[PDB]
Amino acid sequence: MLALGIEGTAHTLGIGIVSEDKVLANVFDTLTTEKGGIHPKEAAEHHARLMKPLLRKALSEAGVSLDDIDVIAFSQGPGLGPALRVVATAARALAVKYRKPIVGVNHCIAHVEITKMFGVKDPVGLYVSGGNTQVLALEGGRYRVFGETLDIGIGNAIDVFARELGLGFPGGPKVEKLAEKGEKYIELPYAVKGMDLSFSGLLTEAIRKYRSGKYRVEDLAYSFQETAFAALVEVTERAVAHTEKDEVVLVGGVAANNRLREMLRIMTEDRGIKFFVPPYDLCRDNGAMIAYTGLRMYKAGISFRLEETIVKQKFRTDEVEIVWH
Template sequence: MILLGIESTAHTFSCGVVKEGEILSNVIDMYRPPEGGIHPREAAEHHREVAASVIGEALKRAGVKLSEIDAVGYSKGPGLGPALRVGATAARTLAVKLSLPLIPVNHCVAHLEVGRIVGAKDPVLLYVSGGNTQVISFSEGRYRIFGETQDIGVGNMLDKFAREASIPFPGGPEIERLAEEGRRYIELPYSVKGMDVAFSGILTAALTCLKRGERLEDICFSLQETIFAMLTEVTERAMAHLKKSEVLLGGGVARNRRLQEMVRTMAEERGATFFVPPPDLCVDNGAMIAYTAELMYRAGIGVSPEQADVDQRYRTDQVDVVWRGGERGDEVRYEEGVLAKGAEAVLRRRELFGLPAVEKVRVKKSYRLPALDEAIRAGRTRNEARMLEAIREAGVGAPRIYYYDPDGGVIFMEYLEGIRLKEVLEGGADGRVLYLVGEALGRIHSRGLSHGDLTTSNIIIHRGGVFFLDPSEGSVMK
């Protein structure tokens, strides 16, 4: 079986050919604006001009004739509308000419699927590109988004900074080069809430540094260290929440060597396995579309040319991943005496003055700069103790704090013999449990409190009551 795939979501028009899961060719032609950022209509015009030659070259390199193609895959979205329509039109034209089925592929899902070429079985994907920043993993028949940017994609943020710094498009590679010459870390906002991130505030702060005359190399260094630490942290949170032992990088920003180093370090410290595809499979490319289209086609997915549409906001979690079974990576196991190993801390069962207790230690993260790491660990330890007490004062369940040391990142708290809401839901909880959770949240919010990391791993059902854990990113709402 031979599949041809067309990619055209943003600045790149690409065509790839895949046979039985093997990539035969992957031709990429990227639009580079003479100045400024990408205009959708200009990108679409570029795609129209190069489409025929790129497709022809892909077939030539693959050593395949058009008549040998079994189906055509194309990027349905998400992406820039005008650019998407060029790719869809090219795919429809081929399908009509050759009487072939069309396979509409989700661009983000394709980044994840092609990562399996390097050996990942059931990874958490950190997908970082111009318009997308998501933490994704397979769960219950779909690729679920466990965390994402709350404003702009990390690649777009880097490109916006680059434009203001007179760095030509694409700005990421030059920012990476300049960062290697940085000598001083400039403090920038560290914007993480649970598994979500935000970049607008960091961009504003970096531009302020630029205007006041800070060395460009130092700003680039600080920018990378901050945003990549954020991305690595939220990825580790997803791994801890899902108890998965593989992490995969994907998207154009995944080519950054410093980001790869950070995520690899995090994975090694967790005893997990790190994967990243070759550079030409990290960027937008037609091979990943063809590769994913083949999987979908074998599962019976296909549309007629009349049904081949595009969707600028086609989310990853809209796709029914019927071609995937229940394959899992290696099970995460904790060493003896460890109750849990989260993204930030290790929890151990202890006894304090005869009382059953939990020792929570926020461990040092070697992927972060020491000064940044120390500030985060101390600040969150202090805030967790404060917020747990505030939640208790609101009449809601939370463990008592026996002792805490912000500088050491240590908290001793009450041990609760219960079950996490995550396991309760997986076992088929009834509506009563969810009602109790909602009722408790209502009391928390009525006191002007925000938990900050409200996942089902941070809620325990204990003796029929609801108890909240780890509000270290919480705040008092004004």
């Protein structure tokens, strides 16, 4: 069986083709802005322009046509509405034209499920992107949230901090570079709030201490990361200990960060359990993860009626029953 997956919850439009065991195609195009941040109306146009090229390109790279495709899958949410609607219309178009089944896929679940194409069985998952930050795990038939940002994503937080320091886009690796040179740990607001995560307090304080001049730049970068990431490890560890699972996965654009990986590996080694990060192309926002989850769903008898394919800008992870596990 083959599945076509279209992803566009955010800036990236991604089209991907997979079967059960292998990825046949995985093609990308992220919206590049000079100023950064979220622009929902621009991405929608972006996704509409690139729909035909990437779609034509993915089918080619896999050496297949739409009649070989068994199911069409799309990122239903969560995310920016105008982009979700572009994705959904194109997906609905194809199901009507080729009379193929169509499934609505949860972006967040897709991020964790893709690891299961790589011999990971039942992990606690840490999803960290620009605007998403979530520790999730399968418990009682659904992917439950064990901790999430109450405001801004870790990725976006590292961006604001970078532009404040004058650093050039992309902010991610630039703050990571500096961090590796810092040698004084300066105290900053803790990012764990009850069960969840908060980066707003931490972010604005880190900026206030930067503006004071009293500290070395590298030292603040080091501290800003450590605190943010220590919080991510703690919530992840809380989940591991609670669920008694023996695998941890790290996913999302921010999985790039080596210091993050490192801290999670330290934690996973103490407890003596598996730590897996998928290849970067199935880590960042991509269509293959959508196609893959989409395919499992379909193989388990899930097929959406048109009425059921409305976009869900605020899609909760615990809304989808995981009948295919």
